[PDB]
Every structure is written in structure tokens, then in C-alpha cells.
């Protein structure tokens, strides 16, 4: 129903080498379609999805010169930030940038994003109103005053509400067979006795799309999350995703526990019980 | 598609 377009930017300064590392990736939902690496031989924007390949030379040469400017911007940003926090040039630092847009089940604009991070911590972020900036510290205020004077937020809105959305709609149409599909999870339960009095029940969810899924364990009809092990959703490597949840269960009381799977391509939420 | 404007920090 609802879809998204994302661009992730990573710039890491390398004191040991001559040039800082820059990596830029583009995502439509949970599928990667473009990449750019500063240490790559080609020095061009690279297709990663099958459906993005149908774009002409006009697109690729334009996206190449754009990401190169993005790379150049973040190289300067590394030097600007080290001066803000008064840090030495001997230490490595990471600048993370993310921007993109969300559409609803009607393919209309819902949310827009534009945010930065320095060494893991938040720096500057565009608010939900698309007119405001959130500065984390006093060094972020200097950036905030630069962008408010240049009216960058107003320039950004034209991209997020327009260009980001209309190109996302173009991608969804071109990759109809891949992006508009919905895969239902294959579910099964596995059992392992950890001790003479306890046992682990694992609730598997395999081969599903998109990655967004909910796995909850219940004891006697009540949500148990205090004694639940949940792993990060992992890609299979073909377009589908995988995830599981585990609980510590006293021996003989395995049937008192239930797993609940919620997915978009699933007509009804499934209840799973050990037998 | 990428954003055509490139603001610095």
C-alpha cells in the first residue's frame, strides 16, 4: 500500500589515506536500485535493480554529476564539522545523511525527510512541517542559520513534495512486477531443550516482502515481551526477508505459549502453537 | 532521482 524512496549518504574521513570514503545508496522501499562508491573504478552512478536499467543516458549522466557534487559537499562537510567541534585531523569521523519521501496507499505525499548525523549522534533534521529545523547543539545552530538565510527548507520542499514523489511513482510503475508485489511469510515453529527444566521455542517467518513484519509472543493470551529474544530483520539475498523470535519456556508448558505473525500480504494474523 | 541543490553544513 504505502511506499517510500530513500537516499543514504555515508562519508568517512581517512587520516591514513589521501581521500575520504564516500558511499551513496538509493532505496525504493526495501529494494536497492542505485549505488555510488568513491573507491570504485567507474566513478559513476551504478544500477542495482533490474527496473532502473530502463532509464536513458539523460538520467545516468545527470545522477552521476549530482552524486559527485554530493560527494564533494560531504568532503567539505567533514572539514567544516571538525572546525565546529574543535577536533584534530588525526582522528577519523563519520558524517551520515538521509533524505527521502513517503507516499500512502493512494500514492500521495505523506512525510518528507532530511537529516544528518555526526559520529552517531544527531546533528540537524527537518521537522514534520517541512519548514522547521531541529538543531541538536550549538555547532548545529551555525548550520541552521546558514540554511534559514538561504531558504534551503523552501527549496527542499519542492523536491520532497514534487520530484521525490513523482520519480517514486515512476519507479513503482516501471518496477511493477517487483515493487508492487506482496509475499506472504512461510511460518514454522522449532523446539530445543536448553536444560532439564527449560526449553526454547523459536517462531520462524521466511520468504516475505516487504521487510515490515510483527512477531509477538503471548502467554495465556497476554503479550510477553519481558522474556523475548528478537533478531533484526535479515535479507535472504533474492528480494525476500527473514525473521524469528524466541522465548524461554519451562518444560511441559510449551503449549501455553503462542506466536502471532502480522504481515501486509497476510489476509489474517496467524496464531502458532507448538504440538 | 537525486536532489539538484547541494547545501553545505
Amino acid at each position, epitope marked *: 500500500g504505502s511506499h517510500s524512496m530513500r537516499y543514504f549518504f555515508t562519508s568517512v574521513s581517512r587520516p591514513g589515506r589521501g581521500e575520504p570514503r564516500f558511499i551513496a545508496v538509493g532505496y525504493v522501499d526495501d529494494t536497492q536500485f542505485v549505488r555510488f562508491d568513491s573507491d570504485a573504478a567507474s566513478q559513476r552512478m551504478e544500477p542495482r535493480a533490474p527496473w532502473i536499467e530502463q532509464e536513458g543516458p539523460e538520467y545516468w549522466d*545527470g545522477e552521476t554529476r549530482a552524486v*559527485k557534487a554530493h560527494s564533494q559537499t560531504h568532503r567539505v562537510d567533514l572539514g567544516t564539522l571538525r572546525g565546529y567541534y574543535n577536533q584534530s585531523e588525526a582522528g577519523s569521523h563519520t558524517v551520515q545523511r538521509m533524505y527521502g519521501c513517503d507516499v500512502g496507499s493512494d500514492w500521495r505525499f505523506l512525510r518528507g525527510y532530511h537529516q544528518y548525523a555526526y559520529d552517531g549522534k544527531d546533528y540537524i533534521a527537518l521537522k514534520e512541517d517541512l519548514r522547521s529545523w531541529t538543531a541538536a547543539d550549538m555547532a548545529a545552530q551555525t548550520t541552521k542559520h546558514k540554511w534559514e538565510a538561504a531558504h534551503v527548507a523552501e527549496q527542499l520542499r519542492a*523536491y520532497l513534495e514534487g520530484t521525490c514523489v513523482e520519480w517514486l511513482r515512476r519507479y513503482l510503475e516501471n518496477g511493477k512486477e517487483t515493487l508492487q508485489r506482496t509475499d506472504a511469510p512461510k511460518t514454522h515453529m522449532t523446539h530445543h531443550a536448553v536444560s532439564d527444566h527449560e526449553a526454547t521455542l523459536r517462531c520462524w517467518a521466511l520468504s516475505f516482502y516487504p521487510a515490515e513484519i510483527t512477531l509477538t509472543w503471548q502467554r495465556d493470551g497476554e503479550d510477553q515481551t519481558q522474556d523475548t529474544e528478537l533478531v533484526e530483520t535479515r535479507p535472504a539475498g533474492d528480494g525476500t526477508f527473514q525473521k524469528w523470535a524466541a522465548v524461554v519456556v519451562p518444560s511441559g508448558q510449551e503449549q501455553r505459549y503462542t506466536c502471532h505473525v502480522q504481515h501486509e500480504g497476510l489476509p489474517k494474523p496467524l496464531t502458532l502453537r507448538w504440538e | 532521482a537525486l536532489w*539538484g541543490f547541494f547545501p553545505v553544513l
Partner: T-cell receptor
Amino acid sequence: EAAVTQSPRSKVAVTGGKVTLSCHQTNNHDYMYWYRQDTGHGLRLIHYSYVADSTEKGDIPDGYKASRPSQENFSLILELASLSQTAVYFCASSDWVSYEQYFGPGTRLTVLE
Amino acid sequence: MDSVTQTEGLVTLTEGLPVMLNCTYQSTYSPFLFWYVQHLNEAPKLLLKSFTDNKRPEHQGFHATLHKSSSSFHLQKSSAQLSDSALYYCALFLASSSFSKLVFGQGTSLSVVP
């Protein structure tokens, strides 16, 4: 104050001769532009640069080639001069705020058979 | 698409009278417009911006209000003076290209007479 300079200020060339237009800028700007003006009307982009050693094509690149050896200098080169290249050439400069461009004094160029 | 249309040719005005120079534009998304002034034997320089607030921006004096509904950004002044004799460019800063750049119009020559 942001000041941009051009050389030469005036140039007379023959058809099929090499012409080089220089532009110096000492404002610490990454973005530099080459425009042309025809009979006191219209300002069209020929080539531009956002960083040193890299040049991008503008609106009308045909018959023109450009070079950015350093941040300060951005050259416009004409390998084969034609009659249609008779114009007044302006050199612009800006930072990331690319809508506020600072222009040079201009260069009158006339190509004759 | 992505175009600027100005008042064609020479505009002759007597000193004291209000200045009016037209600028219409074609654009794909929410854009921003700028006026560039060029005096005789001088470099073209930025005159005024479209910011600030709902349509209204402007410096020297000179002012312009942006109307997004009909895509208009006309240059205005209360009382013209002899020093206003110059060429005026209306520019559209590309709202969304692969690379954002200024698109200049054909330019309107103002000739204020005494």
C-alpha cells in the same frame, strides 16, 4: 567584496582560429560559470564547474570547451571559431548558494572571415 | 518547460512615474525567481529575491511580489529616476533538475527619460 576578473577584455579573432578566455576569482567559491550575451539580450549558459579538474556542459555547449585547472581559474576555449560565436562573454561565480552569482566585467569577442 | 518570458525590447519611461517590467514563467515545481540588473559597461548583479514571505521580496526602491497562481514576478518601483537606466534580467532558479541552475530571460531594457 566578491570580485571576478576576466582576460582579455576585448579580442578580435579569425574564423578557424584558437581563442582562449580566462577568468580569475579570489572569493573561495567552488562554483564557476561561463555565460554569453547576444546584442544586449539573453544570457545563456555554456559550461560550468562545481569543483577543480571537472567541467560540466551547460545549455549550449556545442563549439565550446572549458577547463578548470584550479579553484581560482576557469577557462573557456574555442578550438574552431565561427561567425555565430560573436558575443559578449560573462564569467560568473558562486558558492553552494548558486542563485546568488557574482559576475565578471565581460569580454567582447568578434570573429571575422 | 522551465522558461522565462519578459517584456520584449525597450521600455521608455518618464522620471517620476512608476516602473513596471513584466516576467512570466513556466515551471514544473514550486520555484524561486530573481531579478538581475546590468548597467551600461558594468557587470550584471543581483537586484532582489523572491523570498522572505508569501510572494513579496525586493531591495533598492525596487520590489517584486511573486504570484504562483498565474506565475508572475513583475518588477516594480514607486518613482523612477534617471539612474534606473539599465538592462534588467528576470531569472528562474531551477526548482528541480539534476543540477540546479539559473535560467535567464531575454532581458528588458529600461530607458528613463528626463
